[PDB]
Design an enzyme around this catalytic site. Structure first.
Site, PDB file in Angstrom:
ATOM      1  CG  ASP A  95      -1.720   1.144   1.415  1.00  0.00           C
ATOM      2  OD1 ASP A  95      -2.193   1.454   2.550  1.00  0.00           O
ATOM      3  OD2 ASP A  95      -1.931   1.787   0.337  1.00  0.00           O
TER       4      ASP A  95
ATOM      5  CG  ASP B 215      -3.198   4.460  -2.210  1.00  0.00           C
ATOM      6  OD1 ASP B 215      -4.125   4.876  -1.442  1.00  0.00           O
ATOM      7  OD2 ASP B 215      -2.404   3.506  -1.966  1.00  0.00           O
TER       8      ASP B 215
END
Lengths: 329, 6
Positions: free
Chosen positions: A35, A219
């Site tokens: 992440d 992201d």
């Protein structure tokens, strides 16, 4: 020295991407979600309530000869989609794609929200945003990549995500052989802890880039491409069947739409997301209505270049230079 | 959708 770790989409709608990580001695292999939008490496563990962890692989630090508990350390994180988790902290050896960080902060969840409980195929996250975002108190923990960076061939990592196919997370080198254009870089602003950058403009359906710049974050941990209402409006303007669906909380349209591409400027280079990748998924099995991969960021208040965009490219997260590279794939 | 540390 490098690492190369195969990743795969967790389901048919590419909700998230899963990669194996080996923690401890001997190695306990956990499927984790890498992440670049958070800064904590946390896992389901033997300390996670069994009612939350059942069906998930877990890290058990007492079976690892290299684990150590970090006295007094705790952490809690709230994510953009409302999910959350919290716990205490160990250090242990963490190996990704054959490259090891010997003493890495491994945050053990003693509480996780229902979203993580239900997602049996993952066992936590590897936070790859900036160290400043790490949530361990009183003393923050460095991310796995920050710890790895000074000992890799180069202090960079790449994300190669694909629709419905395995891809890769690589560390320490740039495998442009998966791409068809060269890496184009733009500077990263790490003031908010993210891989934040500015695209110099965009285009819908292949004309020249406009100069309407877009500030947003790269992201790997967000499914969608989340952009402001003006861009969403421009993207769907000639998609005849497009409409907001209050139940889906997003724009939907007929699955057979031939969707326009979405292009954006990385400095003066263009990255183009083909219309194929802007159709995320049918609303359910056999449906004639599909959910768009590009949706509004108005709810979260920050634009996010999530997996829908990342799938169009080999994306270089260059921590040594604090820049972000994109090679057209 | 998922959106990962707002």
């Amino acid at each position: 020295q490098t690492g190369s770790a195969p990743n795969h989409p967790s389901d048919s709608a590419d909700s998230e991407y899963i990669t194996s990580v080996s923690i401890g001695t001997p190695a306990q292999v956990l499927p984790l979600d890498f992440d670049t939008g958070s800064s904590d490496l946390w896992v389901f563990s033997s300390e996670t309530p069994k009612s939350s962890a059942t069906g998930h692989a877990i890290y058990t630090p007492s079976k690892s000869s290299t684990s150590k508990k970090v006295s007094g350390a705790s952490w809690s994180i709230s994510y953009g989609d409302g999910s959350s988790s919290s716990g205490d902290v160990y250090t242990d050896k963490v190996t990704i794609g054959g490259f090891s960080v010997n003493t890495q902060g491994v945050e053990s969840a003693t509480r996780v929200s229902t979203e993580f409980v239900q997602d049996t195929v993952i066992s936590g996250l590897v936070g790859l945003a900036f160290d400043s975002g790490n949530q361990v108190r009183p003393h923050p923990q460095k991310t796995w990549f920050s710890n790895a960076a000074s000992s890799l061939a180069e202090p960079l990592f790449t994300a190669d995500l694909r629709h419905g196919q395995n891809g890769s997370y690589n560390f320490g080198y740039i495998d442009t052989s998966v791409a068809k254009g060269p890496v184009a870089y733009t500077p990263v602003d790490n003031s908010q802890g993210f891989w934040e950058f500015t695209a110099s403009g965009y285009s819908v359906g292949g004309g020249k880039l406009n100069r309407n710049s877009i500030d947003g974050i790269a992201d790997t941990g967000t499914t969608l491409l989340l952009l402001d209402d003006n861009v969403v409006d421009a993207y769907y303007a000639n998609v005849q069947s497009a409409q907001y669906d209050n139940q889906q909380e997003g724009v939907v349209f007929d699955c057979d739409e031939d969707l326009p591409s979405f292009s954006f400027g990385v400095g003066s280079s263009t990255i183009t997301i083909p219309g194929d990748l802007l159709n995320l998924t049918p609303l359910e099995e056999g449906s004639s209505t599909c959910f768009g991969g590009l949706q509004s960021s108005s709810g979260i208040g920050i634009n996010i270049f999530g997996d829908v965009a990342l799938k169009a490219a080999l994306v270089v997260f260059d921590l040594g230079n604090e820049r972000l590279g994109w090679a057209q794939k | 959708x998922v959106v990962x540390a707002x």
